[PDB]
Protein backbone atom coordinates (compact mmCIF):
# COMPACT_ATOMS: atom_id res chain seq x y z
CA UNK A 1 0.00 0.00 0.00
CA UNK A 2 1.25 3.49 -1.05
CA UNK A 3 0.76 6.88 0.76
CA UNK A 4 -1.61 8.29 -1.94
CA UNK A 5 -3.90 5.17 -2.00
CA UNK A 6 -4.46 5.55 1.77
CA UNK A 7 -5.27 9.25 1.28
CA UNK A 8 -7.44 8.20 -1.70
CA UNK A 9 -9.56 5.82 0.48
CA UNK A 10 -9.44 7.61 3.89
CA UNK A 11 -8.77 11.31 3.12
CA UNK A 12 -5.79 11.24 5.53
CA UNK A 13 -2.16 12.00 4.63
CA UNK A 14 0.09 9.38 6.31
CA UNK A 15 3.08 11.76 5.99
CA UNK A 16 1.43 14.22 8.49
CA UNK A 17 0.53 11.70 11.28
CA UNK A 18 1.91 11.71 14.87
CA UNK A 19 1.21 8.48 16.88
CA UNK A 20 -1.71 9.41 19.20
CA UNK A 21 -3.10 11.90 16.62
CA UNK A 22 -6.84 11.87 15.68
CA UNK A 23 -5.85 10.68 12.20
CA UNK A 24 -3.65 7.91 13.68
CA UNK A 25 -6.62 6.52 15.61
CA UNK A 26 -8.96 6.86 12.58
CA UNK A 27 -6.63 4.73 10.42
CA UNK A 28 -6.75 1.82 12.88
CA UNK A 29 -10.56 1.84 13.34
CA UNK A 30 -11.92 -1.63 12.63
CA UNK A 31 -8.45 -2.87 11.58
CA UNK A 32 -6.90 -6.01 13.11
CA UNK A 33 -3.85 -4.51 14.84
CA UNK A 34 -0.80 -6.30 16.26
CA UNK A 35 -1.46 -5.29 19.89
CA UNK A 36 -4.86 -7.03 19.74
CA UNK A 37 -4.28 -9.98 17.40
CA UNK A 38 -3.53 -12.38 20.30
CA UNK A 39 -7.35 -12.34 20.70
CA UNK A 40 -7.86 -13.44 17.05
CA UNK A 41 -5.59 -16.54 17.45
CA UNK A 42 -6.92 -17.76 20.82
CA UNK A 43 -8.20 -21.37 20.58
CA UNK A 44 -10.62 -22.87 23.15
CA UNK A 45 -10.34 -25.62 25.79
CA UNK A 46 -11.45 -27.94 22.95
CA UNK A 47 -13.80 -27.91 19.92
CA UNK A 48 -14.46 -25.14 17.36
CA UNK A 49 -15.99 -22.43 19.65
CA UNK A 50 -14.45 -18.90 19.98
CA UNK A 51 -13.18 -17.99 23.47
CA UNK A 52 -14.51 -14.95 25.33
CA UNK A 53 -11.41 -12.80 24.59
CA UNK A 54 -11.82 -13.54 20.86
CA UNK A 55 -15.58 -12.74 20.90
CA UNK A 56 -14.80 -9.61 22.94
CA UNK A 57 -12.26 -8.28 20.41
CA UNK A 58 -14.61 -9.17 17.54
CA UNK A 59 -17.35 -7.05 19.12
CA UNK A 60 -14.89 -4.25 19.98
CA UNK A 61 -13.61 -4.08 16.43
CA UNK A 62 -17.16 -4.20 15.00
CA UNK A 63 -18.12 -1.32 17.27
CA UNK A 64 -15.19 0.75 15.93
CA UNK A 65 -16.57 0.49 12.40
CA UNK A 66 -20.08 1.46 13.52
CA UNK A 67 -19.13 4.27 15.97
CA UNK A 68 -15.92 5.59 14.39
CA UNK A 69 -14.27 5.73 17.86
CA UNK A 70 -11.99 3.71 20.08
CA UNK A 71 -12.18 4.43 23.79
CA UNK A 72 -8.78 4.34 25.46
CA UNK A 73 -8.30 1.56 27.98
CA UNK A 74 -5.77 2.11 30.82
CA UNK A 75 -5.32 5.91 30.74
CA UNK A 76 -2.50 5.86 33.35
CA UNK A 77 -0.51 3.19 31.47
CA UNK A 78 -1.01 4.98 28.16
CA UNK A 79 0.09 8.41 29.46
CA UNK A 80 3.16 6.74 31.00
CA UNK A 81 3.97 5.01 27.69
CA UNK A 82 3.60 8.30 25.79
CA UNK A 83 5.73 10.20 28.32
CA UNK A 84 8.74 7.85 27.90
CA UNK A 85 8.41 6.36 24.39
CA UNK A 86 10.87 8.66 22.67
CA UNK A 87 13.41 8.23 25.53
CA UNK A 88 13.05 4.48 25.05
CA UNK A 89 13.56 4.90 21.29
CA UNK A 90 16.60 7.19 21.68
CA UNK A 91 18.22 4.85 24.22
CA UNK A 92 17.53 1.85 21.98
CA UNK A 93 19.29 3.66 19.10
CA UNK A 94 22.16 4.71 21.32
CA UNK A 95 22.81 1.28 22.90
CA UNK A 96 22.16 -0.87 19.77
CA UNK A 97 24.03 1.27 17.26
CA UNK A 98 21.06 0.81 14.90
CA UNK A 99 19.27 3.87 13.46
CA UNK A 100 15.49 4.21 13.85
CA UNK A 101 12.96 5.91 11.55
CA UNK A 102 9.42 6.42 12.81
CA UNK A 103 6.84 4.84 10.54
CA UNK A 104 3.20 5.57 10.04
CA UNK A 105 0.83 2.57 10.16
CA UNK A 106 1.63 -0.17 7.64
CA UNK A 107 -1.27 -2.06 6.06
CA UNK A 108 -0.50 -5.61 4.91
CA UNK A 109 -2.54 -5.46 1.70
CA UNK A 110 -5.02 -3.36 -0.25
CA UNK A 111 -8.00 -4.60 1.85
CA UNK A 112 -6.65 -2.51 4.78
CA UNK A 113 -8.10 -5.10 7.20
CA UNK A 114 -4.79 -5.92 8.82
CA UNK A 115 -2.10 -3.47 9.98
CA UNK A 116 0.59 -2.68 12.51
CA UNK A 117 2.08 0.51 13.82
CA UNK A 118 5.79 -0.12 14.42
CA UNK A 119 7.42 1.98 17.14
CA UNK A 120 10.33 2.05 14.71
CA UNK A 121 11.82 0.87 11.44
CA UNK A 122 15.51 0.02 11.76
CA UNK A 123 18.43 0.61 9.35
CA UNK A 124 19.18 -3.16 9.31
CA UNK A 125 15.64 -3.99 8.00
CA UNK A 126 14.13 -4.95 11.40
CA UNK A 127 11.12 -3.40 13.04
CA UNK A 128 11.06 -2.04 16.59
CA UNK A 129 8.52 -2.54 19.39
CA UNK A 130 9.02 -0.33 22.48
CA UNK A 131 7.36 -0.84 25.87
CA UNK A 132 7.46 1.36 28.96
CA UNK A 133 5.67 -0.93 31.44
CA UNK A 134 3.52 1.02 33.90
CA UNK A 135 4.81 -1.25 36.72
CA UNK A 136 8.48 -1.86 37.41
CA UNK A 137 7.24 -5.35 38.34
CA UNK A 138 6.62 -6.07 34.64
CA UNK A 139 9.86 -4.47 33.59
CA UNK A 140 11.68 -6.83 35.95
CA UNK A 141 9.82 -9.86 34.60
CA UNK A 142 11.04 -9.02 31.10
CA UNK A 143 14.46 -7.84 32.26
CA UNK A 144 15.32 -11.11 34.03
CA UNK A 145 14.80 -13.02 30.78
CA UNK A 146 14.35 -16.75 30.66
CA UNK A 147 11.17 -18.82 30.40
CA UNK A 148 8.05 -16.59 30.11
CA UNK A 149 9.90 -13.23 30.08
CA UNK A 150 8.03 -12.16 26.94
CA UNK A 151 4.29 -12.56 27.45
CA UNK A 152 2.52 -14.42 24.62
CA UNK A 153 0.35 -11.39 23.79
CA UNK A 154 3.52 -9.45 22.94
CA UNK A 155 5.02 -12.35 20.94
CA UNK A 156 1.78 -12.46 18.94
CA UNK A 157 2.14 -8.66 18.46
CA UNK A 158 5.74 -8.93 17.30
CA UNK A 159 5.12 -11.87 14.96
CA UNK A 160 2.02 -10.22 13.47
CA UNK A 161 4.10 -7.14 12.72
CA UNK A 162 6.49 -9.39 10.74
CA UNK A 163 3.49 -11.01 8.98
CA UNK A 164 2.15 -7.56 8.04
CA UNK A 165 5.48 -6.05 6.96
CA UNK A 166 6.94 -9.25 5.38
CA UNK A 167 10.01 -8.77 7.64
CA UNK A 168 12.34 -11.38 9.18
CA UNK A 169 13.19 -9.99 12.60
CA UNK A 170 11.96 -7.50 15.16
CA UNK A 171 13.57 -5.69 18.10
CA UNK A 172 11.64 -5.76 21.38
CA UNK A 173 12.85 -3.24 23.98
CA UNK A 174 11.54 -2.29 27.41
CA UNK A 175 12.44 0.94 29.18
CA UNK A 176 11.87 1.95 32.82
CA UNK A 177 13.14 5.34 33.92
CA UNK A 178 12.67 4.42 37.62
CA UNK A 179 15.35 1.69 37.50
CA UNK A 180 18.57 3.07 39.02
CA UNK A 181 20.48 0.88 36.55
CA UNK A 182 19.66 -1.72 33.89
CA UNK A 183 16.60 0.30 32.82
CA UNK A 184 16.86 -0.34 29.09
CA UNK A 185 16.93 -3.88 27.79
CA UNK A 186 16.12 -5.42 24.41
CA UNK A 187 16.01 -8.67 22.48
CA UNK A 188 15.82 -9.67 18.81
CA UNK A 189 12.84 -11.88 17.91
CA UNK A 190 12.99 -13.93 14.68
CA UNK A 191 10.09 -14.54 12.28
CA UNK A 192 8.40 -17.79 13.39
CA UNK A 193 6.69 -19.65 10.52
CA UNK A 194 4.34 -21.45 12.95
CA UNK A 195 2.89 -18.01 13.75
CA UNK A 196 2.85 -16.96 10.10
CA UNK A 197 0.79 -20.04 9.13
CA UNK A 198 -1.60 -19.49 12.07
CA UNK A 199 -2.26 -15.92 10.84
CA UNK A 200 -2.59 -17.19 7.21
CA UNK A 201 -5.35 -19.60 8.40
CA UNK A 202 -7.24 -17.83 11.20
CA UNK A 203 -7.15 -14.14 10.18
CA UNK A 204 -9.15 -14.40 6.90
CA UNK A 205 -11.94 -16.31 8.69
CA UNK A 206 -12.03 -13.57 11.36
CA UNK A 207 -12.35 -10.91 8.63
CA UNK A 208 -15.14 -12.90 6.90
CA UNK A 209 -17.21 -13.24 10.10
CA UNK A 210 -16.83 -9.52 10.69
CA UNK A 211 -18.22 -8.87 7.18
CA UNK A 212 -21.25 -11.12 8.01
CA UNK A 213 -21.92 -9.33 11.30
CA UNK A 214 -21.59 -5.89 9.66
CA UNK A 215 -23.99 -6.88 6.82
CA UNK A 216 -26.56 -8.10 9.42
CA UNK A 217 -26.83 -4.52 10.81
CA UNK A 218 -26.49 -2.65 7.50
CA UNK A 219 -22.83 -1.63 7.79
CA UNK A 220 -19.85 -2.22 5.46
CA UNK A 221 -16.13 -2.02 6.22
CA UNK A 222 -14.71 1.29 5.00
CA UNK A 223 -17.69 3.40 6.03
CA UNK A 224 -15.70 4.58 9.05
CA UNK A 225 -13.43 6.68 6.73
Amino acid sequence: MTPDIILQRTGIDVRAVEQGDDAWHKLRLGVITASEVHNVIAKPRSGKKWPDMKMSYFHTLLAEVCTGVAPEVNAKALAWGKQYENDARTLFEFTSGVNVTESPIIYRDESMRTACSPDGLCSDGNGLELKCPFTSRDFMKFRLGGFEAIKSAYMAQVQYSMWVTRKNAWYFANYDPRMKREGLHYVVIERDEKYMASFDEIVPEFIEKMDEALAEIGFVFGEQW
Partner: protein, 66 residues
Protein backbone atom coordinates in the same frame (compact mmCIF):
# COMPACT_ATOMS: atom_id res chain seq x y z
CA UNK B 1 24.98 14.62 45.14
CA UNK B 2 27.79 14.89 42.49
CA UNK B 3 29.54 12.34 40.25
CA UNK B 4 32.43 10.49 41.90
CA UNK B 5 35.90 10.04 40.30
CA UNK B 6 35.49 6.32 39.71
CA UNK B 7 32.28 6.79 37.69
CA UNK B 8 33.59 9.76 35.71
CA UNK B 9 36.66 7.72 34.79
CA UNK B 10 34.77 4.71 33.43
CA UNK B 11 32.45 7.02 31.49
CA UNK B 12 35.39 8.88 29.91
CA UNK B 13 37.24 5.68 28.96
CA UNK B 14 34.05 4.29 27.31
CA UNK B 15 33.34 7.55 25.43
CA UNK B 16 36.81 7.31 23.90
CA UNK B 17 36.50 3.60 23.10
CA UNK B 18 33.12 4.42 21.46
CA UNK B 19 34.35 7.58 19.74
CA UNK B 20 31.64 9.75 21.33
CA UNK B 21 31.93 12.98 23.33
CA UNK B 22 30.26 14.70 26.28
CA UNK B 23 29.22 17.80 24.33
CA UNK B 24 28.00 16.16 21.11
CA UNK B 25 26.57 12.82 22.34
CA UNK B 26 26.30 12.22 26.07
CA UNK B 27 25.07 15.56 27.49
CA UNK B 28 22.33 15.86 24.83
CA UNK B 29 21.21 12.32 25.71
CA UNK B 30 21.28 13.06 29.47
CA UNK B 31 19.43 16.35 28.87
CA UNK B 32 16.68 14.52 26.96
CA UNK B 33 16.14 11.67 29.44
CA UNK B 34 16.58 13.63 32.69
CA UNK B 35 14.47 16.57 31.34
CA UNK B 36 16.94 19.37 32.09
CA UNK B 37 19.60 21.43 30.27
CA UNK B 38 22.80 19.63 31.25
CA UNK B 39 25.66 21.67 29.77
CA UNK B 40 28.61 20.01 31.56
CA UNK B 41 29.42 16.69 33.24
CA UNK B 42 29.79 18.62 36.53
CA UNK B 43 26.03 19.43 36.34
CA UNK B 44 25.26 15.66 36.54
CA UNK B 45 24.37 13.82 39.79
CA UNK B 46 25.90 10.47 40.70
CA UNK B 47 22.56 8.72 40.10
CA UNK B 48 22.27 10.24 36.63
CA UNK B 49 25.87 9.35 35.88
CA UNK B 50 25.37 5.74 36.95
CA UNK B 51 22.47 5.45 34.49
CA UNK B 52 24.54 7.13 31.74
CA UNK B 53 27.44 4.77 32.40
CA UNK B 54 25.10 1.78 32.13
CA UNK B 55 23.99 2.88 28.65
CA UNK B 56 27.59 3.32 27.53
CA UNK B 57 28.51 -0.20 28.79
CA UNK B 58 25.61 -1.66 26.83
CA UNK B 59 26.66 0.32 23.78
CA UNK B 60 30.25 -0.96 24.21
CA UNK B 61 29.13 -4.58 24.71
CA UNK B 62 26.95 -4.70 21.57
CA UNK B 63 29.73 -3.03 19.53
CA UNK B 64 32.37 -5.51 20.87
CA UNK B 65 35.03 -2.76 21.39
CA UNK B 66 38.54 -3.55 22.65
Amino acid sequence: TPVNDETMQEINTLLIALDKTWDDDLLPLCSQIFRRDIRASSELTQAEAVKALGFLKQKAAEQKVA
